[PDB]
Amino acid sequence: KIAQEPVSLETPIGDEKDSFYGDFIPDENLPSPVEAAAQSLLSEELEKALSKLSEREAMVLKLRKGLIDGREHTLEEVGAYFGVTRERIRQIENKALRKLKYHESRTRKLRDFLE
Amino acid sequence: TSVYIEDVLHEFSTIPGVKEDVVEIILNLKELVVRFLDPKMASTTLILRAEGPKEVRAGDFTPSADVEIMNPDLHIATLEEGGKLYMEVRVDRGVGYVPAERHGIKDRINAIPVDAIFSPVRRVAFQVEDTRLGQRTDLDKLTLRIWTDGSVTPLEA
Amino acid sequence: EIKRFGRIREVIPLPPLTEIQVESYKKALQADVPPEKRENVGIQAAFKETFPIEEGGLVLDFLEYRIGDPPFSQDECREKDLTYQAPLYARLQLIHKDTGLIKEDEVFLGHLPLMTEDGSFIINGADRVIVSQIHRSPGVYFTPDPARPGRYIASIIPLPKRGPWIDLEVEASGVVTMKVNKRKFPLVLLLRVLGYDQETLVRELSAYGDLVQGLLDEAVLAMRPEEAMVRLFTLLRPGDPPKKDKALAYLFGLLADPKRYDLGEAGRYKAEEKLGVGLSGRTLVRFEDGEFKDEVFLPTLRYLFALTAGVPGHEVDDIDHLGNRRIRTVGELMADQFRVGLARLARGVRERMVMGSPDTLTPAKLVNSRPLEAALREFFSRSQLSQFKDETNPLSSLRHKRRISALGPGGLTRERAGFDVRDVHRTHYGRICPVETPEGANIGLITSLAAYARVDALGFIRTPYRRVKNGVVTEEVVYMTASEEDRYTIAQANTPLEGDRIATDRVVARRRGEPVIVAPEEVEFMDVSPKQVFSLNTNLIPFLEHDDANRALMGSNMQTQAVPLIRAQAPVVMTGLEERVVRDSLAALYAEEDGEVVKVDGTRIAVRYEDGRLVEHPLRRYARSNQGTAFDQRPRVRVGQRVKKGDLLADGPASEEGFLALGQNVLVAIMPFDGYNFEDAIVISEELLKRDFYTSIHIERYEIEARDTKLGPERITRDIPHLSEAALRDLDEEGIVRIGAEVKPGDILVGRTSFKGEQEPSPEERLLRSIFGEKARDVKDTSLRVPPGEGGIVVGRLRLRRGDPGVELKPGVREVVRVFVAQKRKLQVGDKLANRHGNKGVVAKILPVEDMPHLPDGTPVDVILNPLGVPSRMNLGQILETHLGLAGYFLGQRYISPVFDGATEPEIKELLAEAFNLYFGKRQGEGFGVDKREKEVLARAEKLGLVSPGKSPEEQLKELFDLGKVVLYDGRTGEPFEGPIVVGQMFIMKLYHMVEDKMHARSTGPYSLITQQPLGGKAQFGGQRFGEMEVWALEAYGAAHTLQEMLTIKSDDIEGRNAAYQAIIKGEDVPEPSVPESFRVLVKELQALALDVQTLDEKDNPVDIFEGLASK
Amino acid sequence: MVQVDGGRFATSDLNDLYRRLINRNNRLKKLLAQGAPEIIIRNEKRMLQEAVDAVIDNGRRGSPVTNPGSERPLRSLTDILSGKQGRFRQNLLGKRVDYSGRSVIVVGPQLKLHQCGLPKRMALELFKPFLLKKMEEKAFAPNVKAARRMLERQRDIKDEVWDALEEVIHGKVVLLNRAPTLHRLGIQAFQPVLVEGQSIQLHPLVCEAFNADFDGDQMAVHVPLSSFAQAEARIQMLSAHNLLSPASGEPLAKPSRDIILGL
Amino acid sequence: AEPGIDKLFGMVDSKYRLTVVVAKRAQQLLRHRFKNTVLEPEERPKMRTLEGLYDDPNAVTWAMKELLTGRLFFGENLVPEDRLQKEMERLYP
Amino acid sequence: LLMGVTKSALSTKSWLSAASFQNTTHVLTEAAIAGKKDELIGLKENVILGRLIPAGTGSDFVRFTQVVDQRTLKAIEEARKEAVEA
Amino acid sequence: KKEVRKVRIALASPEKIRSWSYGEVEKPETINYRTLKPERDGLFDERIFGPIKDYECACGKYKRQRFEGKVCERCGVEVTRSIVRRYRMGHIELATPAAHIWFVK
Amino acid sequence: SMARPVSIGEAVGVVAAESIGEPGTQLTMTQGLPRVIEL
DNA sequence: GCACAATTTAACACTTTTGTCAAG
DNA sequence: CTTGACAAAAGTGTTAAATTGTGCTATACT
Ligand SMILES: [Mg+2]
Ligand SMILES: [Zn+2]
């Protein structure tokens, strides 16, 4: 398998002289418009769906998913952020997600994005 | 409308002991006329069985209540030596022309729809001549000719 | 019933039309032929030429070659994607030069693809075909100088890559300079080692005139062969030091070498009887004891200097003549590539023996596979003379085989063909079809063979004729060659033959293709039949003499674009060739001996023949082809009956009872209909959709592979992470779609599972994943869902996993799945439709049987064609076809009208008088009379003089009905049409092109990797292109933004298309795009050229088009 | 350089060029160090001046370098620019686009000069970004994402859409182009009237300007998104408006064939 | 055909000037959802539908009927590009 | 000096015009040498830049138009007098 | 952020091209036959042209936009968008000066 | 096209180009198209 | 083509952090 | 909301296995 070398992208395909093999290759290294709009809808709907939660748990939630600084903060950090223990934050998440569960099982706005 | 056979996976399948494929059988199933002895029926199910060396036909079906074939001589399939064939159809009544591609069946595993030619009227031709039965001249004698199959009488038409 | 016309009775039937691909290949096979007594030409000419291999010192030699029985059958090689080939072993002998010790030891060569029954090989598991090639025949030729008016330039050519070109052009000097491989050297020079000095350069030179002295030099005439040999050698080869023996060994291979110069037998032969001498071999000279004994160069001047003089018998040759042009067939090029590929092995032989252990060696270590194997594998695929077989219908392959291409490697190209290699030469006649050829820019470039034409060994084409002695047609059937034709004086088949004798004193004939009035005495020959004057498809066109070539072209080719039909029906008017077509195409089943049918069973037809042995002929029902057109064979016989050998037991895909059946015969109405038939358009009757007319079947191929990535191997299964019970329905068990289940555009045929490259989910996405807590499985769905527009049932399951018996899979591939999809397509609205007279059109809006232009018998027509493209395109064939069809309707008798010999106006007129006399009588009998509406039409038509006044309506409508026209009632109104309208039965065809497969559109699809431009084509799921033409058009309109839309947001722009799908989806007006991104790449590409491309603004100022990107 | 289905790789010719360059330019740098004879230097340095040029204009000197075994010339920097299919003519002054498509053409007798039959299916996937929002406003699905999956999967195209699409259609008109494009009139703006079938209807008169007939000819269709551009499409690019020939000055869509015959 | 075209063309000196007007104005109409314009409830370009007959959402047509009345004013350097977009975004949300 | 349309197409002002025409190699050289800056005066010389065409509706004459409705027009009709009193 | 009405064309000089390049491609290799990652100096090397993946350094210590543009102290790759690999060129330093075939032929 | 004085900002060059560009396919039957090129 | 130094990788013993449970 | 107790997961350190990078041989051969 490793023996065989690559393939010239200039290899003409079909019985014509106007065709190439290069152009027949798509692009996955760049977002599609539908994908930008998709990630936008998730980033939005999740925001408004976030608003309906306790002030502390709304924050702690996006601190554990890395929605704030892009990095994820372990329980040890969150507890030091508010001043609670690493046990309290843990429970806070449990009641958090499960609290949005109820609103989502209804509104069904975010029931999508299930691939 | 609806057709099913024991060993068939599709409209192109070939059943042992048969001369023709399923689609040629449907080619004769679209030419099959069956009247209803009752005006209140919305459907039915015809049954058929054939063994041995025999030529199956519309008359070979299993007779029942409120059904009469008007063409027992309609050739369906030719069963050769030992050829065994089971078959059943659902002849529903409707109006106009609806191809199989527009109506479903979902009877069972392989339920193959067929085109529907309702229109028991085959052809109609009328002629307008000069009538001798009235006061003045240049009048018309209408003569309408009706050609229909078995399902309905021309008068009824 | 059946009826035939014409007084011309063919004496010799049509020879098998399939032998041109099979026989010419058969000769070069010599499979049956014993290893001792063979023919030496063909493939054994490749062995004896590349042998013996001689070069401390060795001698190999060829002995025999065996034909390996095929490793696998046809079908297997097809479903395995394997080439249908077979081992070719070979026995040679390695002998010591000194030791006198002999070592034989047979070895192996490779796999040589074998031809099937029809005449088409199978490469890489695909059905391909080798089309014939054409190029001028080898020999000496003389033409007027392309530069000088007052002379003629001779020339010599052997074969492509079998030797160099040779030309003698006299430069404007008065001396002479021969040219070969781009260089000019004195013609007198060349005679160096040729054995001609001064006194010899005069003796036959002075036999002419003024041309003696330009052929006598001095400065080089002093020296002799071994001196001037190096003289021109220092010039023609300034790559290596001007040595002596290196000028001997070099030039030895340019002419004297019979193995490095292969002058086709045609060349030796023809050029021989042309010049007036004779050659021993195929060579220009001879390596005789050191120096070079002349062969060709001396006799090529005894002609070239004779013609230029003006002596009788010596003259210019016709470059485009057919006797000067040969046909490269299968057994020709196959052998050429085999030998030139074998010489590459001969060198791989001479490098192994010259080292290692010269004592212990056998050819078992001295040969090789690849130099030959790859040489053949290359030809059977990449060459222009090998392409995808035409399976669109049975007649399709039969035409594709008889096609002669002027293109290909050793042919010509679209550049160097002006007129000459296109135009129809006088000699063409019964050899090449004068009409059939692609309507595109290739007209005249690729034509076909004539139905009676043949190709001998030399390559010339000989057309059948009949000898005659003083108005007596002899049974002698002569196949005269192209040149042989110009000699005698040939008559025609339409000649006045009275009982094997001549009738008129002025008969039609010609000389060299020059029509002239001729006497009953001076007639030397005659035509077998006008059929030979055309091709196959062209001969399927009735009343073709009533139409024009332009339309006949399409009328033929479209028949190849034709598709089968479930209810397909042969025309009620043919030329009577369809019979031989269905047979010679070998698409049907017949009786080999005189048997009796034992069992029908539309799978296997058993027939126990009189020979007592029981033989059955299994059938292939509903099987995919190349174009998707099904291959069906309908059994025609009872459960038992005795038949005679040659009798049809089963139809073909297009065959009806042994008659080629393309489309169907409907009732055509020639009349304008609300402009729906506008400009060669077509309307139709819904009543056709009822009988399933013009309704065919199509199959499609779908496959997938289990790749083993870097991460890990994939696999086929019914397991998918996010899938729902619904989509998993039709998949039976192992996770593949069952047999006979619906597949909508986007249904999963076969599921595949693969490990996605591990990448952390985006933060928002990680939260969403944290709500439902859906387990993120390593494996993701790789499955294969059928593309849009393609839907139907599933009639096949072929899965071949590797490591299985009889199947080799590509390295790195576990398994492969292949599903077939059947579709019953009904004639839709817009699908192509045409007739045998080259009248195209689409389907514009069918129409309820209710409102239709019917007749007094309540019979509605089925088409309503527009009476416009008749007077323009000038094809009156469809008119006479329909004219006969009109009577043939009431008589039901199928007619056969041979090409250029057939029913005339009086005949058909008689059939119409008959058909009417019984038709109208059916009205009288059934209790009726002349309709009032009919009276109306007869009257207003009598006013214009369409019917002779003073005659009763019976006779008027009789003259009209026989004219081809009748009275039509509009199904809508009920009133009769003003004038009479012609109708009748006509043959029409549903062509290849189907809207269903040609329709497409997209919004936001994939984009090219290089530039973000949208992909093209259909399958790529992409939009159309906006040509420079379009850009200009928009510019002419003045649409600024509409043009920019095409150049930004909708094409290669990045943020633009995203802000479009963003805005539109929310309603805001589309933002203003910026960088086309093709331009950014254009600029960077220029930067690679050390070109500083700077963008400015409103005042000579730097503008950064790459945001923070390349700034550094 | 990227891999495709099956696992096999692919690469540009300019890569191998840009490689076979560095090789020689490197070996040379080693020789100019280790003290090697002038012959080897002068020759090795020669292949540098030719390789470099090969990455620039390949073929303007000698037989072009090709991948070993194949006769296919390597495409250099200059090979991309100049030429029919080069980055100028194929990727700048023309390109494939978004929101478009095509099909066979069919006669329009019941259609005004501003009308055309637009395929039911083709229009849906053509206006998808629009209809999505039309489904947003007009109930049925809560939001944009819903509409998407509610459409792509499952031909559930029930009247909820078959009508709403008509709601986003009214007003704005699309464009039909017949190739070759000679006359600017070979691209006209017509009203998107949803019709059954895969075919496309066109007005019989202006059908002449496209040099078109229905023998199986095919036309392409695009949608002018920007309202600014849409205006252009209806004001000038509209077929109804341009009736005269911009070339001759004489009328364009006039009676033809059948019509003439009747009148 | 677009009714009024003979009058529309007959207004501006050029051809395309009309397009620029129709376009920009339609833009202002879709920006404010028709609450800017000069049309009375019987002038409003209604769109008939099987459901209900509302006002045609197409801005192009709205701009058409708008200029056909002449109630609109257009020209080069009419007003400062600053306030022109400042007071247009104020009067209406 | 009269010349063929082709000669005039290659002898034009902008470099981008002939660059997309033909003999590109010969164009860019002579261009870069003298360092010529295109003004994008021509249309095709613009289409390359993916900009707005100098002609048509995008013309530098008619693209400067402005549209105002009576109510808002008077609303800005007061705007000019709000700077003289303030 | 500024109108574009003019486009110049000039001759690039070696010292200018040195400014363009983000690195000198030394090793004439493409990628590893196994890891499929750009070779140390390979013509596709991320360490100069840019990351193959958005806002990720090669070794993967800086994985987020939190750190933007900061060059890695381990791998040496600038954490940024993966799009930068279309606009960031390289250069090759020739031991012996050579001419441009254009001006020559 | 409009039977009225040409509008300002018109692309008339491209217009002309098309105007003579279309007939170029019918000049087969004089000196034909080659003359046109020769001019 | 091979002996082998060079460097990379998977190998694995084990320490520390982090998610987590019953009970205050 | 909080401890303490724990197991699983993620570190951190030293190794055995493997994978890859290099110099080199001697009849003569130009
Ligand atoms: Mg056409
Ligand atoms: Zn790093």
Residue numbers in the entry:
A (entry chain F): 324 to 438
B (entry chain A): 54 to 210
C (entry chain C): 2 to 56, 62 to 1118
D (entry chain D): 527 to 789
E (entry chain E): 2 to 94
F (entry chain D): 1420 to 1505
G (entry chain D): 2 to 106
H (entry chain D): 1210 to 1238, 1253 to 1262
Reproduce, without paraphrasing, sentences from the article in which this PDB structure was first reported.
CarD, first identified as a regulator of ribosomal RNA (rRNA) transcription in Mycobacterium tuberculosis (Mtb), is a transcriptional activator widely distributed among bacterial species, including Thermus species, but is absent in Eco. CarD is a global regulator that is an essential protein in Mtb, the causative agent of tuberculosis. Crystal structures of Tth and Mtb CarD reveal an N-terminal domain with a Tudor-like fold (CarD-RID, RNAP interacting domain) in common with the Eco transcription repair coupling factor (TRCF)-RID, and a helical C-terminal domain (CarD-CTD). The structural results, combined with supporting biochemical studies, establish that the CarD-RID makes a protein/protein interaction with the RNAP β1-lobe, thereby positioning the CarD-CTD and a conserved Trp residue to interact with the upstream edge of the transcription bubble, using a wedge mechanism to prevent collapse of the transcription bubble.
To resolve these ambiguities, we determined crystal structures of Thermus aquaticus (Taq) transcription initiation complexes (RPo) containing CarD. Crystals of CarD transcription activation complexes were prepared by soaking Tth CarD into Taq Δ1.1σA-holoenzyme/us-fork (−12 bp) or full RPo crystals. Analysis of the diffraction data indicated high occupancy of one CarD molecule bound to each of two RNAP/promoter complexes in the asymmetric unit of the crystal lattice. The structures of CarD transcription activation complexes were refined to 4.4 and 4.3 Å-resolution, respectively. The protein/protein and protein/nucleic acid interactions were essentially identical among all of the four crystallographically independent complexes, so the more complete and higher resolution CarD/RPo structure is described here. The structures show that CarD interacts with the unique DNA topology of the upstream double-stranded/single-stranded (ds/ss) DNA junction of the transcription bubble. CarD interacts exclusively at the upstream junction of the transcription bubble.
